[PDB]
Amino acid sequence: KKYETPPHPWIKERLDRERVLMDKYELKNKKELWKHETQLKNFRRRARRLLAARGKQAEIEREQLLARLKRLGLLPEDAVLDDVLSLTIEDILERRLQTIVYKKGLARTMRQARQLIVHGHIEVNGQIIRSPSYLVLKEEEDTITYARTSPFANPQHPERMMIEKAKQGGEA
Amino acid sequence: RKGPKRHLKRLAAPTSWYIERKAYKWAVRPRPGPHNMRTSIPLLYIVRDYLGYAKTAREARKILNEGKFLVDGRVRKDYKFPVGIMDVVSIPETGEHYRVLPNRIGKLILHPISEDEAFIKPLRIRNKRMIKGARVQLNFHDGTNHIVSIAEKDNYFTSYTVLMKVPEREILEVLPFEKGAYVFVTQGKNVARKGRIVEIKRFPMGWPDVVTIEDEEGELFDTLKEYAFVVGTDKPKISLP
Amino acid sequence: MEIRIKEIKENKLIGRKEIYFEIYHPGEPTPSRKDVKGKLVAMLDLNPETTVIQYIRSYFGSYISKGYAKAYDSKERMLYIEPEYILIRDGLIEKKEGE
RNA sequence: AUUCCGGUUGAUCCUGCCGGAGGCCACUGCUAUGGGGGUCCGACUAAGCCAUGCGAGUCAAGGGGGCGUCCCUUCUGGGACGCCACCGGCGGACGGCUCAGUAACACGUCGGUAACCUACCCUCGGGAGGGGGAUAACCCCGGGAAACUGGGGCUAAUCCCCCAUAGGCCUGGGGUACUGGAAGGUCCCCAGGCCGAAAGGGAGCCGUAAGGCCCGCCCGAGGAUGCGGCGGCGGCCGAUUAGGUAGUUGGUGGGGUAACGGCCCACCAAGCCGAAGAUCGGUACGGGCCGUGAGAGCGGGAGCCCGGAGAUGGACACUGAGACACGGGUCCAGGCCCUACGGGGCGCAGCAGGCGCGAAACCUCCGCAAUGCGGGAAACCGCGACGGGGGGACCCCCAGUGCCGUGCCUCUGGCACGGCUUUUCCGGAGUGUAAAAAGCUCCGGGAAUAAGGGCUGGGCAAGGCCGGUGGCAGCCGCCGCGGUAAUACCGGCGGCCCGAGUGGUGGCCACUAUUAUUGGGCCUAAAGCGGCCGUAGCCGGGCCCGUAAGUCCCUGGCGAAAUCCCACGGCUCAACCGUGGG
């Protein structure tokens, strides 16, 4: 499982959080947010444990975890286990497919890519990713182009016009 | 169970053959022979997996029968056969020679050594005992045996190096282990290491017997006399993880 | 469509080259085995009835296919040795042997 | 990743129960699970029984033939395949299934059989000389509806045997040499006794035949593999079970076993066992792990792997290294079926499928192709073991159910209307089949096109109104709510949650310091024995000294794989699996 459902699940305070982010990162289900929360939670659990124990646990393992965070971009350059603990569940919503294709500005908004990705027109690496919950490396940012294209194989298609209106980039 | 298991399962196949263990449900069980089933490397794995020369067990069985491997100087033909540890496996058809060695990981690796060394097989003998005509005979854990002496004290108690000429099944160039000799460690949890014996002194009574060694780096290890295996003054080279 | 050779093995005992293919299809359907017959004989560089086609799977939407083929010297050897799927996909023989 | 809320009252604080909120696992309602990936399915029932198909064979290159056919040739004549029965050899003890019983040296880990065996197989050494002999096939022939059965003439083989060459085993006496931690196993000589080895190969290749590649046999030794055996420690509940035991504890001799042994036996003794819980009743395959929990702890033994146990209930032997034998036999008990009523045959708690049961669980499918294995030089044969699809609210994971302009409303959005791209869906292409399927995916045509269910008084304040009705009908997990302006009923409308699920019931774990070790108490809330005595047990002032048992440190043997974390990689992606590290 990658579903996290907290001890009190219809509390006021959780519910407010959830409602507000739905075109701020793109939701169409709560689960999608729950995956990201579970990835971060496990990472912070492991980071906490290693720091707790003496130096007699083998440092190789702490080196391998820290490495992965450099690539993913949560600890961009940081190299500190305490630094993992401080992480928000808002730094992993920003590394979503839908908010990193819109960052570059190939997707008009995060909302736009909910039929680009289905219909297979946004490629990363050598392959069409189909998943909003896919998490993108710093490496992976250097190759975001298109494939198997029909509205980008026809500029003359009005699809091309709706997506790019003076070129809407960044994140919102 | 009331009978030898003729089938081995894939989930019963270890990680020491470095095999995918969810592949089917049945793993190749050698017929009883030199060596243990889980401490062996199958002939199926060596042709099929290791080299890509088969993509079905029919390919590999046909390939072995026509001939692509001789183990210890003699012919084989089916893929069922437990290949031992410290053996000599041969590709005559490629001219490769391998040693069957442990890693620090404790998986069986074939470690390449030159065509020259294929001739040699180092024996450190398993026990030494009298047979009729008042001659003592040599033994091994791969069953590899020789007969005929005059009895007596002979070269050692049981910690030997022999040079073995493998097509002839002959023994040559006998040599003791000393307190300045080489051992490679091939059982225990200290495996893959090759060094110089500091001293062979031990705990003099009961079942435990320690032997101790140092290396090139010079780390201090302790292992059983049974898990000390005398290479010689070095014959095969070290195994790498 | 474009066939390129990635990886080449030389198996001496049976006298064959065992070979890996990456085959492309960009904006085009999944590669068509009937043109691939016509294309093969030149790539492998062996006669047309002893240049053998086997294994292809085709990626979902990513336009690259991974695959394997055989180039044989010996017409005698190949039907006997090989596992049945190849022999039908190339067209040589079927399915060997029932109950 | 460590959270609390309603409810004892007029209000208050403490104590304490109940209910609810979380995870997990069955089952049940609606709907759905499109599409795709991995797990899974009489798994808490009757360890009930079965129609029908099926799980066990295989060598003619051991072997002389019978039949069909081939190459021939069309003769003499030798070379092949299928089919067929007899001895050989090997599998059939395995593989597959289930877990009733069993609380124990069942199982796990470490030990350990120098008390014991181990064929096929694998290694090294050596041997296979000579003589003797059969029965199916073939030929002929009787009966039974059957099952099944036959009597005889001939006859092959790695056919079945004897003898010798020896070896094996026992036993008495001498002595050395190998191995050991020791005890002492292995050496050799000698005497007397027994048993008294072996077998070969067709068309090819190697050797002269044997022999060998190949297949198998014999003896000596070893290895591997399987079986049995012993010990340390760990090994459930009820004390409304407290004393138990007569091969029973031991000694001595002996039998029998592969072998130790009160295993069995004779004799001799009266011991053995118990409150650190014996014995008895009761329940339960155990383990790796798993579920839950921040931990401590609690709970569990299911797919799957490991070891043991079983195969209608019970008893019994033979062949084999190995069975007292899961689709073998003998027999008894129960039950079924065929029947000239004389007499036969069985065992799905094996697999499809059936039927009974109940709250609950599948196609009389497809293949031998891949995986494993037995036999075979190989070719290849056998395989409902197995690989897969089918079906299945069984679990998990991934993904789509749109997007833009947009007048105007509830603008983290919605609807009208316009435009665009476009999952299914059609036609085509690969896949794959190892011949289907699973049809997806890709390309061309091409649609905004599968979304539901629960709740709305307080707990969840997350979500509010109308009409009917008026303590009714009903609602309810708890507290409650209805005796006529009802947010609570019922219908309708709206909104909120979650999403191929939602919700209900049952159970388990957290919440529960309501089991207190972490982390609880006993004036009055539940809880001090009416008081003492002293036993078992628990606990001990100061100073020294010996031991280093407890206690701390270090090294080394080891605690199977899988499950778990971290890392990277592959499958669009991920679940998952590989690999390395922990």
Side-chain angles (χ1 to χ4, degrees), chain A residues 2-5 14-15 17-37 93 96 98 110-111 113-114 131-133:
Chain A
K2 290 182 177 183
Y3 302 165
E4 192 281 289
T5 295
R14 192 192 176 234
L15 284 160
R17 186 273 303 261
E18 299 181 278
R19 271 180 220 163
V20 180
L21 288 60
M22 286 181 73
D23 196 6
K24 310 309 192 60
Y25 293 101
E26 252 304 308
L27 310 177
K28 278 206 185 183
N29 281 311
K30 309 305 177 200
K31 47 175 190 164
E32 300 167 349
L33 171 62
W34 303 337
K35 296 162 202 162
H36 291 339
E37 287 193 68
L93 303 181
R96 303 174 73 111
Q98 311 190 81
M110 55 275 302
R111 185 181 191 86
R114 282 281 186 163
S131 283
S133 292

Side-chain angles (χ1 to χ4, degrees), chain B residues 1 17 22 39 82 98 104 125 145 155 186 193 228:
Chain B
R1 167 168 60 194
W17 292 355
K22 312 300 165 71
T39 307
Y98 307 88
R104 274 285 165 174
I125 68 185
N145 283 16
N155 175 245
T186 195
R193 198 71 187 95

Side-chain angles (χ1 to χ4, degrees), chain B residues 49-76:
Chain B
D49 295 272
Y50 208 89
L51 294 177
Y53 282 163
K55 282 179 181 46
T56 182
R58 285 186 60 243
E59 290 181 62
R61 185 260 285 113
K62 188 62 273 197
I63 296 165
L64 288 162
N65 223 119
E66 296 191 35
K68 181 59 178 172
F69 276 95
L70 300 168
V71 180
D72 305 328
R74 44 188 184 241
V75 310
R76 305 283 177 222

Side-chain angles (χ1 to χ4, degrees), chain A residues 73-87:
Chain A
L74 308 183
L75 272 52
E77 287 182 304
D78 304 297
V80 172
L81 296 178
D82 295 88
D83 289 30
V84 188
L85 300 166
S86 320
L87 293 178

Side-chain angles (χ1 to χ4, degrees), chain C residues 25 27-34 55-62 66 80 83-86 88-89 93-99:
Chain C
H25 42 299
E28 297 283 282
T30 50
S32 286
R33 285 284 208 91
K34 46 176 142 63
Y55 178 48
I56 57 177
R57 204 199 56 114
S58 307
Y59 292 48
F60 303 189
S62 307
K66 48 187 162 66
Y80 182 74
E84 295 61 79
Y85 66 112
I86 294 162
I88 183 171
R89 287 172 198 203
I93 188 166
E94 296 296 81
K95 201 177 188 157
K96 301 195 301 191
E97 302 291 4
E99 302 187 302

